[PDB]
Structure 1
Amino acid sequence: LLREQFQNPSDEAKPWTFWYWMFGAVSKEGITADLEAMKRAGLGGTYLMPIKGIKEGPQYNGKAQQLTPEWWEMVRFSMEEADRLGLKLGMHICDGFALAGGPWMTPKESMQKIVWSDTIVDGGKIKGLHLPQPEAYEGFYEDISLFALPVKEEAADVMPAQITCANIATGNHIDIKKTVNMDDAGVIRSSYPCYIQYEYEQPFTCRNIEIILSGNNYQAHRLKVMASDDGVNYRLVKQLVPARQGWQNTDENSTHAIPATTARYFRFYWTPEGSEPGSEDMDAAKWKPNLKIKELRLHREARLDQWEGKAGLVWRVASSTKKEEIGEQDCYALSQIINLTDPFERTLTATLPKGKWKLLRMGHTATGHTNATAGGGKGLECDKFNPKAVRKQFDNWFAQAFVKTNPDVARRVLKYMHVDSWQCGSQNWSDTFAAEFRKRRGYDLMPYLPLLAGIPMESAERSEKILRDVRTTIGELVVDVFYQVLADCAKEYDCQFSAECVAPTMVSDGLLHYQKVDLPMGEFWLNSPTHDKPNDMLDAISGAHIYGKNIIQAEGFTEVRGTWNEHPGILKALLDRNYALGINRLFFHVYVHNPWLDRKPGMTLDGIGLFFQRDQTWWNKGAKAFCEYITRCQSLLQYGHPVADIAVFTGEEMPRRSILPERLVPSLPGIFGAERVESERIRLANEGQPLRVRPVGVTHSANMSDPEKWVNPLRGYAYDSFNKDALLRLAKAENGRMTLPGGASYKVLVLPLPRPMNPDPAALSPEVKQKINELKEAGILIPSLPYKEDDFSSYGLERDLIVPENIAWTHRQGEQGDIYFIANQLEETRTFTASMRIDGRKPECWNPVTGEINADIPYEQKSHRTEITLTLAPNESVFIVYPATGLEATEYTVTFTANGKTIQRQELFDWSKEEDEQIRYYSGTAVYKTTFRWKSKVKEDQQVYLNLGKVCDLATVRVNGIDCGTIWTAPYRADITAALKKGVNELEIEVTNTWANALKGADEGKAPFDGIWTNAKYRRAENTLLPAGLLGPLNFDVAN
């Protein structure tokens, strides 16, 4: 029954934590203390993951380097203690937090890429010729083919150039030293509009520019190319366009094609005007809009536009190459190419026709990626397309946890196998790739292998059709090999399989892998706009919904710079909007193991939060009460199936992933509303490229999308993104709706306009065209775009929930009835109407903070909907469920637990404004004791609240020794009804703040007690003491 799930939730409803072991510094005494704290807070389990080793942190004197006998003894003891306490465990598939590496992997067994070497020679008879050796990682390299291409032009690929620059920006304060300049090594820097000029001795013909960088630089890809024969009259060649790109973009340079241009002078003009704001698919646009280029390489030999990404070496999306850029005469036919593979530190002997020929020697080598955050378990990443390599990774780490510990205990407690978010670049080859390509795509890749160096063949269109097939195959192999093999291994060891995202680092369909896993998992960050991953969150939730996975996990509260002012009151709105998106099992990031019992707050992940661990000031009472709210919420939010009326198709480009709401605004302007259309015009215009600092010390693009401003963006409908695999393999028409196994059922199917991640757009395959037609004939609404009405009520599809803005919500339904989660996102008390798409059933209001149920709230039935009036306090949330006078106190005694000080006061006070330093700089818990008089006996159906006024930051209330609650969020009041008596009552309130004030104290030689230490170095920029204590005033509230 719903009422007993809410009141006595199951173990599946409890949140979990990540548990990080730092630098091999681990102790048994800390393990016991940590696991007991976790059990007392009400967590269900933890994922044990060690991060770095003694080399990275020698000062900590760690005795538990990964994979040593001493380390395995800590893992065994942890398992033993988890069993005693009734907690469960998981571990990741490698040391560190990403991804699938270890010291047992050789270069041959690691991720592979196609590499090559060039040389030009005269034809006729060739004899014992040595060829240049391609890139070989640690000396590993293997030949595949050797091609001979008849040169298109005899002139050289590059020529010498005199390089100069010129500032063109005028007026006002222009820091003259930040105008364009070139250093000793040729590196070009600028913060103001400028040109860079290349002068050739004789006219040069340029077909593309290879842009080479030091790190990332969005602005480098926005140059405007101009050319001149006479040194004064210049003509426009091309405005360059940045390719879509993710945070791991540095493994390859970028080639921008132009129309073939013969000139003595090339000018590259730059301005920051017209820049796009940062996002997950233009990651470098997050950073300051300054220009920085290591080298521009102007090439003569023809190449496809942005080929590095199109060959799958790196995660990128760009437009197909225009005919103006690569025409018939720029491509090679198959009959022109002479394959010299058969003719054998090797040499070549054979004979060519007369003329000059390019000797293109192709092969493969390792990409060079490692599980970089590992300690003892660090080495090369496994080949993701090789099933024996993938199995080997499993056997050498995760499988060993059932052998090198106690095997019977391991089998009871270690029930979860995790793979985290991908951080190992991309790969475009393996020994099996040709054959896999052959079965799946229906033709041979091998004669076309020079496409993977960007050398065009037959036509531009034909070259790019095949390169898309290479990319498609890459993504298919991530799922059918790496995930498939790991899923077999997990089932063999009786483990559940959780996984986070593959996008935006590895070429993939970002949703596709979620079919092979039990527990899709997303990520959401606290106070970290440059590192948040809302598109990851939508990949995991969309994947779960379309592939029928009921439990959706999330790595929550990850904080790029923690500053020790975080407590549960300021985490609630963040959590609730991610519940509205559709997660239902939270994993806290992060609980770090503190091996010392006399250092507080102790060891952290170099100051990366959330600092969620036993030595937090608010752990004992605050972590517990938060986790109780979380468990009540998650009991209802795992019930039944989620409701979503709209499916949005993710297309046929590669790579691909779920679609962010902002990118749908041009398709559905009516649904989003005019105010959203207008605010988006202004944001994307991005006038002045404004900067924001958040957190302390992280300067970034101010107009980047903020997920807090995208609550209920379709104004009462919900959507999932939806891929070709689900369309072709799972979708079925039933009663005018598109259904999928596991409970998804959509009335609308959107085929969005061309968009930044699908700009061509990629043509729909005949099979996709066929299924869409079928679904349309069966009653599924395929709207005509742009869709301009406010909603879909014209077609019989009303909004699910009608509420005002800044109200986050979700809807679940099953045999026992319907549930709406409704949450206030503002720091304001608000009263509003909520209108739900439910006809003639009685609603109830269930309160997740307190566990109270009000089964008889007022409501009105109107036009076959149900309306209620809700009052929500700041950040307050509620579930709507449908079945099928001043205090007058004596002298306060206030006792500061951590340092034993006690004082006597008549009036309440802010700790941070006291003259005594041991109070002024205090962080921790203080116990207030007083008495008050109650006039009359408590009547029947009379309810009394003690209102606490302003609490900094949480308070537990006790009346005549009876616990009346831990108060951590609005409204700040406790129900004292049952504890009251006539006469004098005893009043005790325990109040706890955050660590900020004590750390500022300790930093300045004014620590308020002994034993303060942390490796977390970041602090609030403001340099102020925060408000602290029970500020009041205290008041009674009597009602019925």
Structure 2
Amino acid sequence: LLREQFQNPSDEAKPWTFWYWMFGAVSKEGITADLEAMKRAGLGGTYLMPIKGIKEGPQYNGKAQQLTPEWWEMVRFSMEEADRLGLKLGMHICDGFALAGGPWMTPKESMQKIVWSDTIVDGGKIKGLHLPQPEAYEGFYEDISLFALPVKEEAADVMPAQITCANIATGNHIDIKKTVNMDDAGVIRSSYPCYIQYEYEQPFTCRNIEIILSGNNYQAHRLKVMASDDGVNYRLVKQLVPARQGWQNTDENSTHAIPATTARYFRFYWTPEGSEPGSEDMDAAKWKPNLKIKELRLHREARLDQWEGKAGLVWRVASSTKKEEIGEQDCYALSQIINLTDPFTLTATLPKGKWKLLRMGHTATGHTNATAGGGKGLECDKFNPKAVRKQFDNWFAQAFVKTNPDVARRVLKYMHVDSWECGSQNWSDTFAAEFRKRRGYDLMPYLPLLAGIPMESAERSEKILRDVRTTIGELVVDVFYQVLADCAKEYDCQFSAECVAPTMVSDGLLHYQKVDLPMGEFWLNSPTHDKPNDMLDAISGAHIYGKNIIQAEGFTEVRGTWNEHPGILKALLDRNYALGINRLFFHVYVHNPWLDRKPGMTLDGIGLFFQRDQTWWNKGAKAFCEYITRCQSLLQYGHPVADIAVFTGEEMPRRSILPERLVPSLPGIFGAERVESERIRLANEGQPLRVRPVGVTHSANMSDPEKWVNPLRGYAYDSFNKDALLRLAKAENGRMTLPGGASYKVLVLPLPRPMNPDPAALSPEVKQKINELKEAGILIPSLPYKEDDFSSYGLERDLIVPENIAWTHRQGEQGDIYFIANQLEETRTFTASMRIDGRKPECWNPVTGEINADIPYEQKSHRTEITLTLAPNESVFIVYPATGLEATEYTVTFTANGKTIQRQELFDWSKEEDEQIRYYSGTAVYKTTFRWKSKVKEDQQVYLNLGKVCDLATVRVNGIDCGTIWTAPYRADITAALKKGVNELEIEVTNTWANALKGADEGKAPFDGIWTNAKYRRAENTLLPAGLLGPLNFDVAN
């Protein structure tokens, strides 16, 4: 029964935590303390991940370096204690955060890329010639093919230029030292509009510009290229366009093609005007709009525009190359190219003329699991099933050998793969063969496409490179994820996994079919580091592949500042429940090995600081986890409901679509106010900056997922890929269905968009299936869709609520559940109208566990309406079956320093003259008495309203616990504990660490033993309000 699950949830409904061990500083005492604390809070289990080692933190004197017998003994003891407590465990597939590295991996077994060298020679007889050696990572390299290409032009690929620059920004509020300048190493920097001029002694013919950076720089890709023959009259060549790119974009330079231009002068104009705000697929645009260029290389030889991404070396999307940039004369036909692989030093003969000797091979990409300690080394080849198996055998499998095997088999039941951060790869020893099987033709004659050298035509070159990227994405799934899935099943473990996008070339949804537990990620107060697109990848992936439990790495905080408590985490959690997550994992519980240092070890101040030495752990983490468990009990029930599927298209790479990107496709669904807010945000006038958190300056108009609650105004959608369309979709009763309960009425085929700008042509099999779905009744709306909703087609909104109300809907055999959550810090009363006809709603309170089965409701036009009142950040589930306190003198006892005071009136601890109270962080126990005049009458209900609580409070009346109050409304039901006459009142109030850390920083610690490696602090330098501020009142109801 649903009631029993809500009231007595199963262990599958409990939240979990990530558990990090820092710098090999680990103790058994701390292990016991941590795991008991986890059990006390109501956590179901933990993912044990050690982070860095003794070298990275020698000051901590760590005794548990990864893979030492001492470390293995800590792991064994952890399994022993989890077993004793009834907790389960997971581990990651490598040391550190990610991804699949270890000291057992050689360069040959690591991720591979196509590399090359080249040299121009006279044709005729060639004997004993030593060719240049391509890039060889740690000296590993293997030849594949040697081509000879007849030169298009005998002139040199680059020439000497004199480089100069000029500020063009004319005004009076310009810092002259930030205007364009070139340093002694030639690095170009600017904060203001400028140009950079290249002058050649003789006219130079340029066909592309290779942009070389030190780290990422969005602005560098926005140069406007101009040229002159005479030194004053300049003509437009091209406005350069930034390719879509993720944060891991430094492995390759960026080649921007232009129409072939012959000139003595080239000017590269720059202005920050027109800049797009930052996002996950224009990651560099998150940062200050300054220009910084290491080098511009102006090349003569023809290359495909943005070929480095198109070759699969790095995760990028750019438009196909225009014919005006690469025409037929710029391409090689296969007949022109002489294959010298056999004879190759080189000895053979060639027709007269000049030949480019293109020596192609492969080497390691150069990536490690760099956040590891003892387990650090090269990332495994993601296309080599033997290397993937080897990774599994040497870390995860050893947890069942080197510990206690029978205990390990009982408690270590989860195998985790985290979010990818090992770059991309476009080769392996089996890649040619896999390409041949999957794409239906041989890649090998076309291998120079992987260096961006065009063949046959631009269109043909880019059709083949798309096929290369497609193959890459398929091998991630069919090798890496398939092998690990087999391994997990072999070891009786559930497989959880985070995203592959936006660092490894992929269809970002595709791998979720191979795992048990798709896992998203959401950050707290960290706009520059949040991954809303990762969340939608994991949720869409789970929905379309029928994975019912959707995990989420939650609350990661780029700079924790010690003022965080559950009360300010609720709204954030709720909007991610609305997206579709149903098992939270706290990021992060750090192991604090010292029992006499608080709050102790952290991930160098990266939050959330969710651990035993939190001021609010014992009561606050427990109360929050109780709320979480009740929510998850219902949010794991049945199947999620979503009316709309949105096709993710045929470009590579690809992934789920953020709501903002569908606004031009569905302007009527989003509404006019959203259309207008997006116009302004994307215009991004003045490129404004914001600082959030302290010390992190970024693009103020960056999309913020807090502002995208219920963006379709009463419908939900999943992103939906080619795989799911062709392999899984069926039409039943006019809806598109998928195994595991997905059922969509609408299939949106979006307009061309930043991640699919061409757009990539629909394959015959996709057009056929679309038409089949169309004839069977699935709605394929014509775009842009301008009506408010789909009611004209018989598809009404699921839930009609006002703005800033987050929701989701699930359904199964026992009925329908709507989660409804207030995202504002205010009390609201509003109508909620649900697409449910003729059933009786109930209001189930997840904070308290109370069920109100007799709520008023109206039945209008075959919907059901209720009037809800929600306190700040309050949420509720709607389920459809199938007077002044007059206190005596307070005694207040500050538990952490034993100080006791007597006060008549309530007070803010932070305004006290006594420094040990002023800077106090921890718990204080308030004791008083109050008179209650009457016997409590039948059906009468009495609440003690607490007024303002800084930050949480546990109420006891005559010794009876009346609740831990942590979120609005700030009241406890004291009905059952009240007696006529004198009543005893005890309230335990707990704040956050911020005030005591400030005090300790200034030589005014309110007690002994305060220490943390977390050094970030609020910029404001204020003490936070602290304590039971009140006023206290009774609310007597019926």
What is the TM-score when the length of structure 1 is the normalising length? Answer: 1.00
Question: 2:550: which partner in 1?
Answer: 552
SS at match of 1:368: coil
Residues 599-628 of structure 1: CA deviation (Å, up to 9, x unaligned): 000000000000000000000000000000
Q: Distance in 2 between matches of 1:139 and 1:633?
A: 55
Q: Distance in 2 between matches of 1:604 and 1:823?
A: 32
* CA positional deviation for 1:413: 0.4
Residues 852-878 of structure 1: CA deviation (Å, up to 9, x unaligned): 000001000010100000000000000
SS at match of 2:414: strand
* CA positional deviation for 1:995: 0.3
* CA positional deviation for 1:717: 0.3
Work out which of the residue numbers 790, 802, 805 in structure 2 matches 1:804: 802
Residues 151-195 of structure 1: CA deviation (Å, up to 9, x unaligned): 010000000111111111111221111111111010011101001
Residues 308-333 of structure 1: CA deviation (Å, up to 9, x unaligned): 00000000000000000000000000
Q: Distance in 2 between matches of 1:733 and 1:1005?
A: 70
SS at match of 2:719: strand
* CA positional deviation for 1:142: 0.4
Residues 626-651 of structure 1: CA deviation (Å, up to 9, x unaligned): 00000000000000000000000000
Residues 232-282 of structure 1: CA deviation (Å, up to 9, x unaligned): 110000000000000000000000000000000000000000000000000
SS at match of 1:605: coil
* CA positional deviation for 1:834: 0.4
What pairs up with 1:877-956 in 2 under 5 angstroms? 877-956=875-954
* CA positional deviation for 1:904: 0.5
1:511 and 2:513 aligned: no
Q: Distance in 1 between matches of 2:403 and 2:18?
A: 21
SS at match of 2:896: helix
What pairs up with 1:190-205 in 2 under 5 angstroms? 190-205=190-205
Q: Distance in 2 between matches of 1:733 and 1:479?
A: 27
Q: Distance in 2 between matches of 1:24 and 1:747?
A: 53
* CA positional deviation for 1:882: 0.4
Q: Distance in 2 between matches of 1:469 and 1:888?
A: 77
Work out which of the residue numbers 559, 563, 575 in structure 2 matches 1:577: 575
1:38 and 2:45 aligned: no
Q: Distance in 2 between matches of 1:173 and 1:402?
A: 66
Residues 339-369 of structure 1: CA deviation (Å, up to 9, x unaligned): 000003xx11110000010000000000000
Q: Distance in 2 between matches of 1:10 and 1:171?
A: 67
Residues 514-539 of structure 1: CA deviation (Å, up to 9, x unaligned): 00000000000000000000000000
SS at match of 1:118: strand
Residues 129-158 of structure 1: CA deviation (Å, up to 9, x unaligned): 111100000000000010000001000000
Residues 836-858 of structure 1: CA deviation (Å, up to 9, x unaligned): 00000100000000000000010
Residues 644-669 of structure 1: CA deviation (Å, up to 9, x unaligned): 00000000000000000000000000
Q: Distance in 2 between matches of 1:228 and 1:244?
A: 30
Q: Distance in 1 between matches of 2:406 and 2:706?
A: 47
Question: 2:525: which partner in 1?
Answer: 527
Residues 888-940 of structure 1: CA deviation (Å, up to 9, x unaligned): 11111000000000000000000000000000000000000000101010100
- Name the % identity: 100
SS at match of 1:195: strand
Residues 760-817 of structure 1: CA deviation (Å, up to 9, x unaligned): 0000000000000000000000000000000000000000000000000000000000
Q: Distance in 1 between matches of 2:164 and 2:881?
A: 76
Q: Which consecutive residues of structure 1, in runs of 5 or more, have no partner in the other structure?
A: none
Q: Distance in 1 between matches of 2:676 and 2:2?
A: 43
* CA positional deviation for 1:1010: 0.2
Q: Give the number of aligned pairs.
A: 1038
* CA positional deviation for 1:484: 0.2
Q: Distance in 1 between matches of 2:304 and 2:661?
A: 27
SS at match of 1:154: coil
Q: Distance in 1 between matches of 2:994 and 2:226?
A: 55
Q: Distance in 2 between matches of 1:426 and 1:282?
A: 17
Q: Distance in 1 between matches of 2:400 and 2:194?
A: 63
Question: 1:66: which partner in 2?
Answer: 66
SS at match of 2:108: coil
Residues 701-746 of structure 1: CA deviation (Å, up to 9, x unaligned): 0000110100000000000000000000000000000000000000
SS at match of 2:924: strand
Q: Distance in 1 between matches of 2:247 and 2:173?
A: 33
Residues 667-712 of structure 1: CA deviation (Å, up to 9, x unaligned): 0000000000011100000000000000000000000011010000
What is the TM-score when the length of structure 2 is the normalising length? Answer: 1.00
Residues 375-399 of structure 1: CA deviation (Å, up to 9, x unaligned): 0000000000000000000000000
SS at match of 1:978: coil
* CA positional deviation for 1:5: 0.3
SS at match of 1:354: strand
Q: Distance in 2 between matches of 1:341 and 1:946?
A: 85
Q: Distance in 1 between matches of 2:262 and 2:533?
A: 43
Q: Which moved more, 1:74-83 or 1:164-173?
A: 164-173
Question: 1:263: which partner in 2?
Answer: 263
SS at match of 2:72: helix
SS at match of 1:451: helix
Q: Distance in 2 between matches of 1:916 and 1:34?
A: 33
Question: 2:1007: which partner in 1?
Answer: 1009
Q: Distance in 2 between matches of 1:834 and 1:526?
A: 28
SS at match of 2:256: strand
SS at match of 1:465: helix
* CA positional deviation for 1:113: 0.3
Q: Distance in 2 between matches of 1:290 and 1:166?
A: 15
SS at match of 2:819: strand
SS at match of 1:156: coil
1:979 and 2:977 aligned: yes
Q: Distance in 1 between matches of 2:276 and 2:287?
A: 11
Question: 1:741: which partner in 2?
Answer: 739
Q: Distance in 2 between matches of 1:138 and 1:530?
A: 34
SS at match of 2:416: strand
Q: Distance in 2 between matches of 1:230 and 1:48?
A: 67
Q: Distance in 2 between matches of 1:180 and 1:497?
A: 52
* CA positional deviation for 1:338: 0.5
SS at match of 1:554: strand
1:452 and 2:483 aligned: no
Q: Distance in 2 between matches of 1:180 and 1:102?
A: 44
Q: Distance in 1 between matches of 2:1013 and 2:646?
A: 46
* CA positional deviation for 1:550: 0.3
SS at match of 1:868: strand
* CA positional deviation for 1:958: 0.4
Q: Distance in 2 between matches of 1:148 and 1:971?
A: 77
Q: Distance in 2 between matches of 1:181 and 1:104?
A: 47
- Give the RMSD, CA atoms, in angstroms: 0.4
Question: 1:753: which partner in 2?
Answer: 751
* CA positional deviation for 1:6: 0.3
Q: Distance in 2 between matches of 1:600 and 1:921?
A: 15
* CA positional deviation for 1:462: 0.3
Q: Which consecutive residues of structure 2, in runs of 5 or more, have no partner in the other structure?
A: none
Question: 1:542: which partner in 2?
Answer: 540
Q: Which moved more, 1:168-177 or 1:762-771?
A: 168-177
Q: Distance in 2 between matches of 1:389 and 1:169?
A: 55
1:658 and 2:656 aligned: yes
SS at match of 2:46: strand
Q: Distance in 2 between matches of 1:181 and 1:496?
A: 56
